[PDB]
Amino acid sequence: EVQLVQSGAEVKKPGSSVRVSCKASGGTFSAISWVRQAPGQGLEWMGGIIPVFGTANYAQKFQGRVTITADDSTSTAYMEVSSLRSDDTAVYYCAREETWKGATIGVMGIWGQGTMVTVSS
Amino acid sequence: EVQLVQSGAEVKKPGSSVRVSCKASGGTFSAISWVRQAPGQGLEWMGGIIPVFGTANYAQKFQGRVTITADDSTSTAYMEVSSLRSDDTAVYYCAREETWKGATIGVMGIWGQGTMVTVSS
Amino acid sequence: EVQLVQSGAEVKKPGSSVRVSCKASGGTFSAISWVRQAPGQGLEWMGGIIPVFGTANYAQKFQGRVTITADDSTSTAYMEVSSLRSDDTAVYYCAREETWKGATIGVMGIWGQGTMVTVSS
Amino acid sequence: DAKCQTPQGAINSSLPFQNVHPVTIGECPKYVRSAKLRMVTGLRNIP
Amino acid sequence: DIQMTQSPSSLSASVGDRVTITCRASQSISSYLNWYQHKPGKAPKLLIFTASNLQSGVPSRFSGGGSGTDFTLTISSLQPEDFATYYCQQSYTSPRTFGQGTKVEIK
Amino acid sequence: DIQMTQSPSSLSASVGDRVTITCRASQSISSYLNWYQHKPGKAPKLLIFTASNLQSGVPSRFSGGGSGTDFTLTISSLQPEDFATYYCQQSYTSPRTFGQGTKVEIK
Amino acid sequence: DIQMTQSPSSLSASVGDRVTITCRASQSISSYLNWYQHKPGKAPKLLIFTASNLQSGVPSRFSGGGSGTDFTLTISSLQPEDFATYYCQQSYTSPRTFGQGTKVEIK
Amino acid sequence: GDTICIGYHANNSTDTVDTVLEKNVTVTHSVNLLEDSHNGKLCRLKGIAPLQLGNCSVAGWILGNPECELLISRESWSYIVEKPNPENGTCYPGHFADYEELREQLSSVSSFERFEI
Amino acid sequence: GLFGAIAGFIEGGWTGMVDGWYGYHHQNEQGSGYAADQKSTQNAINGITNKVNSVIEKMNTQFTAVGKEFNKLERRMENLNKKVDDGFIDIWTYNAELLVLLENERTLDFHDSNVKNLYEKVKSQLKNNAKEIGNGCFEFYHKCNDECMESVKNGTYDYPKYSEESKLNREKI
Amino acid sequence: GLFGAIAGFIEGGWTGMVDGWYGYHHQNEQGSGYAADQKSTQNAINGITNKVNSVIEKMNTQFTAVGKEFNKLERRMENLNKKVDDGFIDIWTYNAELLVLLENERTLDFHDSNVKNLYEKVKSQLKNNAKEIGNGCFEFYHKCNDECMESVKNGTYDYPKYSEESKLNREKI
Amino acid sequence: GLFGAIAGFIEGGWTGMVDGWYGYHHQNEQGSGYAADQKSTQNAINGITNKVNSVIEKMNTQFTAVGKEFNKLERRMENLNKKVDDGFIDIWTYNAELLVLLENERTLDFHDSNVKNLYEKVKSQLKNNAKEIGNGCFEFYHKCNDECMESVKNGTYDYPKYSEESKLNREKI
Ligand SMILES: *[C@@H]1O[C@H](CO)[C@@H](O)[C@H](O)[C@H]1NC(C)=O
Ligand SMILES: *[C@@H]1O[C@H](CO)[C@@H](O)[C@H](O)[C@H]1NC(C)=O
Known part of the structure; x- marks a missing residue:
């Protein structure tokens, strides 16, 4: 039970960068997953890293535009998307990847709470 | 070298229960064995438990009438026999199951000292 | 990096015993090797022990005349040669057997500094 | 026959780990802030 | 790379009924499935992981199952606090694809 | 389930003699035997465990042996402090059965 | 028991040249070779251990090689601070035999 | 016939343990090295009963309080017992110099002969 | 599961195993049962008992572990004692x-x-007399009475006297 | 290298392995690649994650670990605190x-x-259908399409339907 | 005995092994002896030396571990120091x-x-050229000179040039 405390709510103009945090409660090395909740659309996993491999995997339609870094020192995942556009208006959810049967990979376990990121004028 | 200190000497009427302790000196998880020394007769193993399995094995002519419990917390073995009868007059010996080559099972190692339990009028 | 501090310089008459130390800086259990630097001649390994086996191996032309003992308690190697003779005039070098990739055996790693042992009149 | 005691009761046991209370008078095990040090002693239950 | 086709798209029911949500996968994902219920305006949260195991602190009325290309999630009975959309995830190979969403609404 | 038939039943000897105690078992108990001497009016105590090993703090005059259904216990010599009855135990399978008792008495 | 025959016996060169020192062994010693440079009037010290690895704190200009009965030590270039005699050791079996010594001197 | 089969012992037990490669894994037999039970009362240690100060401080009986003179005047103890913040401690208010040192010393006594000088 | 026998190529345990840990199931003609492997389970129980008892006894015993008390002027001493205890x-x-x-x-x-x-022990004793299957089970080619079990659990499984029978059953036609 | 697979009879690793740890290299007719073994690498990653997170979380947290200061008359206290901290x-x-x-x-x-x-798992699934070579590789006797990989990495490699083909290829003349 | 080689299927050690740990006994025609396996024993000795030296050196060194003394009024301090030392x-x-x-x-x-x-290394090098027996020994089917040992302890035991000889000796009649 890691109390994930994501960043606040922010808005920015199209064609810029975003910074959404996933500050956890205790030191943890389970994977990180990020998902988009666009209004009216379903969930879809964008990117994520595994602190074991260290490689940063991404969706095949998103790579390059989005980068994920999570320093093992603080175990806080960072969320960067370059060249923001309007239809990316959504709320962002961060997963810590930890169920009751220990830290298992390929699941979501506990979830974040949500960060409102709306791109408009 | 675990200094086993069994209970004192006691007598009871036929058709009742008995309580013979096998209070040890230090915490130990080796098996427990109990043997009857009836005057004029030889040794015979009645019952015993293994703190690994936890099951309580017994002689095929004694099961039900005799129960053995030894809480792992205190490692003190208890001796209960229901429906006492006169010919069970004997002295009782408790074995801690520990030789020089570590705690080995299937042996007796060190022994108790004896508790006089005579059933008569 | 074990700072080996061998004994001083000494001279003795032919037909006697010698004591050359190899006092190290820290406790270590790697092997010990001793080599002779006779003026004008090349290196040649005389004897040595492995603190794992504990056996004292020697050159097939030197055994008996030379003994090596290194108490594991102090890890200080001792150098004894009985029946000293003149042509054994040389400087003595002691090896601690420790490279960068841990304590490896079959190498020399770090070396001593030298102890002048000249046998003459 | 307690061999050691805590303020909220006596630990009759003789095992090296207790979480009852830090204050322990007697030849008593050392306190542990955990709640379950259950060591396995057998197999895995796969029926 | 593998699409999670939810089936049926959307139905409605009442309290204490029999409903089945089927997740269909093109490629075989072994048994590394999930089952997320998503309350409207709330953080999503899973029910069944690895297609058989049950998450702690979840009513036993949910029972997942199936393996390969055919899976399932058999709710024993419906209560008024578990009405939402449902998603199935694959994690056998990356990328991780969610589902469409099967809502249940008061009949 | 397996009976430990001591043989011979009872003999007598003197100080410094040759005596053999044979333990016979119906079923093969491998080598999980024991050898207990029981002083009259004293706690019993073993000599040989696993039919070959020697208990610590025991004179070396006792040497067990044999395996399967035939066993033995070869005393090198008799001293006036080891005259008692002798029992053999099986522990290959439960229940654990003791023996009859072979006493040795001053000739 | 195994003799380490250095070859060539002795040559001379200048700063920044190509020199090869060959160690020949009667019996195959696998790859447990060494390569010691011995400054005149100084403690000896190795360069290559196990015939391939490089000792820490050593210029990379030295590169050992070879296995079995034929070995080598290929210096990339000569500098004025590494002119000395060279020895090869075998440690596959005892006794440990050093070499003859190949000196390099200013041409 | 044929078909021997090596296997391992399973049972209806439901005990679960935690390993360094997996958490909450079900086993057959286990043992709780942790102690989480007690008698809930106070009794003898090393064979000697501990001292009992009912609603009395250590100073309350060491300095004989009129309210604490009903003590059980025993001879030896393994450890003294004080009520948490007892009311009738030092009847006269003041500062007990080196009180904690005295308490640490008087924790155990093997023979306690109440004399008068 | 480092060696990968339990939960590896032996999928599930046996509920009827009550006498020993590493038993058998000889579904032979004369009958059946769950006779244990007395040597291996006895040695294993011995080993776990040594492990647990070493965990208990090596912990030395001393008569106090109680933090003392201090007044309002030894906050250094109280904090130091709390630091030591903690x-x-x-x-x-x-x-x-x-x-x-x-x-x-x-x-x-x-x-x-x-x-x-145990599995490689039986496999080495049998070599190719009995083919292997999943779940760590076995399949004796030859006719196999209860004496098989006697020889298998005592380790005296003499290969040659059953060799040719297995050789015949290898193809059987 | 206790079990002697890595740096043992599998001499070198693979640089192209990027998706999983314990992959394959199926140099079959239809193509090639470095498809991972999802079950084994997922379980292994799970295990190492449990190991590391247990190392982190079991360390309890308290609000101070700082040695206090003392003047020139509590050298006993300063030396004692230094002894405790050290x-x-x-x-x-x-x-x-x-x-x-x-x-x-x-x-x-x-x-x-x-x-x-993994190696013994594949070897048991294949038995003698595919001969072994060095480096932990394999050599299927039968013709082997991509469905082989499907069955091998799902564990459902049915031996009998490819048995006789291997039997023919055993000698081939 | 987790892997079950020593005291497992190799019943007893050898008293004549004096040069290395994991030796051999080649009772071949040209002679005999207890030639060690230089690579394996050298690596093993290296490993144990790393283990022991890590046990020694990781223990840091400081100039005191001595409990100080206290008079009859610092019983708190004396008991605290005894608690820390103990x-x-x-x-x-x-x-x-x-x-x-x-x-x-x-x-x-x-x-x-x-x-x-080592045992599986030799077994893999020999495959079925040499049959296995108890005690971890071996039995070469082919005629086997000292060059066998050269190839076996250097790992270069080329199977094919001795393959057919073993194939003949498989039945020999
Ligand atoms: C020890 O105390 C416990 C209290 O739970 C009790 O159950 C047990 O019988 C006691 N044992 C002895 C030997 O006094
Ligand atoms: C398990 O079964 C045994 C006998 O079948 C029984 O004595 C025991 O109470 C059972 N335990 C549980 C938890 O079901």
Whole structure:
């Protein structure tokens, strides 16, 4: 039970960068997953890293535009998307990847709470 | 070298229960064995438990009438026999199951000292 | 990096015993090797022990005349040669057997500094 | 026959780990802030 | 790379009924499935992981199952606090694809 | 389930003699035997465990042996402090059965 | 028991040249070779251990090689601070035999 | 016939343990090295009963309080017992110099002969 | 599951195993049952007993572990005593929990190794007389009475007297 | 290298392995690639994550570890506090370094055991259908399409339907 | 005996082994002896030396471990110092004894694994050229001179040039 405390709510103009945090409660090395909740659309996993491999995997339609870094020192995942556009208006959810049967990979376990990121004028 | 200190000497009427302790000196998880020394007769193993399995094995002519419990917390073995009868007059010996080559099972190692339990009028 | 501090310089008459130390800086259990630097001649390994086996191996032309003992308690190697003779005039070098990739055996790693042992009149 | 005691009761046991209370008078095990040090002693239950 | 086709798209029911949500996968994902219920305006949260195991602190009325290309999630009975959309995830190979969403609404 | 038939039943000897105690078992108990001497009016105590090993703090005059259904216990010599009855135990399978008792008495 | 025959016996060169020192062994010693440079009037010290690895704190200009009965030590270039005699050791079996010594001197 | 089969012992037990490669894994037999039970009362240690100060401080009986003179005047103890913040401690208010040192010393006594000088 | 016998190529345990750990199931003509392997389970039980008793007894015993009390002017002493007690407790918790976890793993793969070593022991005794199948089971080619079990659990399975029978059954036509 | 798979009879690793740890290289007719073994690498990653997170979380947290200061008359207190701090640090350094080293070894032979268990798993699935070679590779006797990989990585490699083909290829003349 | 080579299927050791640990006994026609396996024993000795030296050197060194003295009014201080010294000693005794025992076990099954890995190494090199027997020994079907040992201990045992000879000796009639 890691109390994930994501960043606040922010808005920015199209064609810029975003910074959404996933500050956890205790030191943890389970994977990180990020998902988009666009209004009216379903969930879809964008990117994520595994602190074991260290490689940063991404969706095949998103790579390059989005980068994920999570320093093992603080175990806080960072969320960067370059060249923001309007239809990316959504709320962002961060997963810590930890169920009751220990830290298992390929699941979501506990979830974040949500960060409102709306791109408009 | 675990200094086993069994209970004192006691007598009871036929058709009742008995309580013979096998209070040890230090915490130990080796098996427990109990043997009857009836005057004029030889040794015979009645019952015993293994703190690994936890099951309580017994002689095929004694099961039900005799129960053995030894809480792992205190490692003190208890001796209960229901429906006492006169010919069970004997002295009782408790074995801690520990030789020089570590705690080995299937042996007796060190022994108790004896508790006089005579059933008569 | 074990700072080996061998004994001083000494001279003795032919037909006697010698004591050359190899006092190290820290406790270590790697092997010990001793080599002779006779003026004008090349290196040649005389004897040595492995603190794992504990056996004292020697050159097939030197055994008996030379003994090596290194108490594991102090890890200080001792150098004894009985029946000293003149042509054994040389400087003595002691090896601690420790490279960068841990304590490896079959190498020399770090070396001593030298102890002048000249046998003459 | 307690061999050691805590303020909220006596630990009759003789095992090296207790979480009852830090204050322990007697030849008593050392306190542990955990709640379950259950060591396995057998197999895995796969029926 | 593998699409999670939810089936049926959307139905409605009442309290204490029999409903089945089927997740269909093109490629075989072994048994590394999930089952997320998503309350409207709330953080999503899973029910069944690895297609058989049950998450702690979840009513036993949910029972997942199936393996390969055919899976399932058999709710024993419906209560008024578990009405939402449902998603199935694959994690056998990356990328991780969610589902469409099967809502249940008061009949 | 397996009976430990001591043989011979009872003999007598003197100080410094040759005596053999044979333990016979119906079923093969491998080598999980024991050898207990029981002083009259004293706690019993073993000599040989696993039919070959020697208990610590025991004179070396006792040497067990044999395996399967035939066993033995070869005393090198008799001293006036080891005259008692002798029992053999099986522990290959439960229940654990003791023996009859072979006493040795001053000739 | 195994003799380490250095070859060539002795040559001379200048700063920044190509020199090869060959160690020949009667019996195959696998790859447990060494390569010691011995400054005149100084403690000896190795360069290559196990015939391939490089000792820490050593210029990379030295590169050992070879296995079995034929070995080598290929210096990339000569500098004025590494002119000395060279020895090869075998440690596959005892006794440990050093070499003859190949000196390099200013041409 | 044929078909021997090596296997391992399973049972209806439901005990679960935690390993360094997996958490909450079900086993057959286990043992709780942790102690989480007690008698809930106070009794003898090393064979000697501990001292009992009912609603009395250590100073309350060491300095004989009129309210604490009903003590059980025993001879030896393994450890003294004080009520948490007892009311009738030092009847006269003041500062007990080196009180904690005295308490640490008087924790155990093997023979306690109440004399008068 | 380092050796990969338990939960590896032996999928599930047996509920009827009550006398020993590493038993058998001889579905032969004369009958059936769950006769244990007395030597291996006895040695294993011995080993776990040594492990647990070493964990208990090596912990030395002293007559106090109680933090003393201090008044309002020895806050240095009170904080220092709290630091000592809390550091001792922290070290003990870390060490004890990492132990419990680590030799839990050692116990699991030790049971795994016992089942393994037993499996290769029987396989070596049988060589190619009995073919292997999944779940760690076996299939004797020859006719096999109860004396098989006697020889298998005593280790005296003489290959040659059953060799040719297996050779015939290899193809059987 | 206790189990002797990694750096044992599998001489070198693969640089192209990017998706998983314990992959394959199916140089079959239809193509090639480095498809991972999802089950084994997922379980292994799970295990190492449990190991590391247990190392982190079991360490309890308290609000101070700072040695206090003392004037020139409490040299006893200053030396005692230095002794406590230095002894705690010494115990922590010994324990932490011996841990780091010991479960470094456990991690190495656990990866060794994973590669091992995978190797015997494939070998048992194939039995004698595919001969073994060095480096832990294999050689299927029968014609082998991509469905082989489907069955091999799902564990459902049915031996009998490819048995006779291998039997023919055993000698081939 | 986790891997079950030493005291497992190799019943007893050899008294004549004096040069190395994991030797051989080549009772061939040209002679006999106890030539060691230089690579394996050298690596093993290296490993145990790293283990022991890590146990020694990781222990940090400080100039005092001596409990100070106190008069009859610092019984708090004396009891606290005794508690610190005794707790440090208790932690050190528990840790050191559990270490000594635990890596004694690790050393035993590491030697077991070395003998094991050597056994499967030779078995893989020989495949079916030489049949296996008890005690971890072997039986070469082909005529086998000293060059066998050269190839076996250097790992270059080329199977094909001795293959057909073994094939003939498989039945020999
Ligand atoms: C020890 O105390 C416990 C309290 O739970 C009790 O159950 C047990 O019988 C006691 N044992 C002895 C030997 O006094
Ligand atoms: C398990 O079964 C045994 C006998 O079949 C019984 O004595 C025991 O109470 C059962 N335990 C549980 C938890 O079902």
